[PDB]
Amino acid sequence: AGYDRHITIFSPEGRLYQVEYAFKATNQTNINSLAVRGKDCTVVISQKKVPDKLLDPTTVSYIFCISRTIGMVVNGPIPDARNAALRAKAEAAEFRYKYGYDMPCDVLAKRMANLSQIYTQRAYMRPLGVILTFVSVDEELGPSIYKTDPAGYYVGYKATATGPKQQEITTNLENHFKKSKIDHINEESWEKVVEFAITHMIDALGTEFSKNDLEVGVATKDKFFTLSAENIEERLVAIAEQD
């Protein structure tokens, strides 16, 4: 009867009800993220929220290392994020083996978006409640930022933001690439690009951060790594001593 609301088929106005709902799930964690390009780096800041005093912060991560070169940050319930990360960590190991070069950021995204699409067209499987933000310093394109969503869509961003207060963060960035009229952040060392990414997020969220409320991922050529508890405090200390 009224069961085009429960599976991935067409409503009478060409809508996929189940996908639109799937999107609504990506906020359910209540973490916000943003990503930026440098002259030759890429940066992803996500929030870390550890409410339970019984937790171990070190195990709480929405930032996944997918390959040597490629980083991914998810907005969405943890279970679904891992289902995606594990599948990417493996589509990219397979890619290297079959084809002989490291797997490139935008290709991994097209492949997860293609996947995210099948879910969108098959009755029996459900999409995932995640929005995967992929970063790297791809050997041909430079700093890359590619985002895929439960809809099956992917596209590449100068910078981007995702989650609950997504549009407050997004509109801050828009007003700083209208102003430098480019496609990136003209700073050499990634450190200053991380400071900038934290700055323009404090500005947009109207709250300060401590070394414990942030997760930072960084991509330079030949490496993608995450910043430790302390590697961030240093970044924060430097923001505070100029602002």
Binding site: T8, I9, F10, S11, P12, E13, G14, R15, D106, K110, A113, N114, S116, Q117, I118, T120, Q121, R122, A123, Y124, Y146, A151, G152, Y153, Y154, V155, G156, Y157, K158, A159, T160, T170, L173, E174, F177, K178, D183
Partner: protein
């Protein structure tokens, strides 16, 4: 249920196609889901064979995985047997068969796209085809699909004669797209491809005079702006 998919096609950005005497042309707009996004990272006009391209209206993703499945079928079912690439008519047939099966198969919804496939084969000359979610397909002198569908389809009857040079049809398909345009109108929000003369410039090699290069050429951000000034 096929009827509901044709409806997702009816909304979603306008796209068109015009056959001429010495070429075919297809175009759509690149609606930026944001200014932060770099619109060059997504292609609404995709190459299938060096003699055949395609554009769509509707659901982005369903087009991507249809352009992929489509390139492959060109090899698996033609090139690997007869050494040639497939003719527009038949590659189109093999795509309709692909979509017509998502229809009549259980557990899957049809695709949310109508396709415009343009191309040139040595024996059938030029031709332009439309493919619907229903798996049906029809041959067109020119048409449009999507929102601006009705406005543009009417403009094309008004402006189309069977003596158009390809440059005339480029000119038309730019006007046609100018009235419907949702966002801004330049080379960064227009995608236009043609199926014209053989481009040896673009082969990548030189030494066999029997194969002469792609008929499919995707106009650069520049080539477009240049035409829009003298417009």
């Amino acid at each position: 249920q096929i009827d509901y998919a044709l409806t997702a096609v009816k909304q979603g950005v306008t796209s068109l196609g015009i056959k001429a005497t010495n070429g075919v042309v297809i175009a759509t707009e690149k609606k930026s889901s944001s200014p932060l996004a770099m619109s060059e990272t997504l292609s609404k006009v995709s190459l299938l064979t060096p003699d055949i391209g395609a554009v769509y209206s509707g659901m982005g993703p369903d087009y991507r995985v249809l352009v992929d499945k489509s390139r492959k079928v060109a090899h698996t079912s033609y090139k690997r047997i007869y050494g040639e690439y497939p003719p527009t008519k038949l590659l189109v047939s093999e795509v309709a068969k692909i979509m017509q099966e998502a229809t009549q198969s259980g557990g899957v919804r049809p695709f949310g796209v109508s396709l415009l496939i343009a191309g040139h084969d040595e024996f059938n000359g030029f031709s332009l085809y439309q493919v619907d979610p229903s798996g049906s397909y029809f041959p067109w002198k020119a048409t449009a699909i999507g929102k601006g569908s009705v406005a543009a389809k009417t403009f094309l009857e008004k402006r189309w004669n069977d003596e158009l040079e390809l440059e005339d049809a480029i000119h038309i398909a730019l006007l046609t797209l100018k009235e419907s345009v949702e966002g801004e109108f330049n080379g960064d929000t227009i995608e236009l491809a043609i199926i014209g003369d053989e481009n040896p410039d673009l082969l990548g090699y030189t030494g066999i005079p029997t194969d002469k290069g792609p008929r499919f050429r995707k106009l650069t951000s520049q080539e477009i702006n240049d035409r829009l000034e003298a417009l």
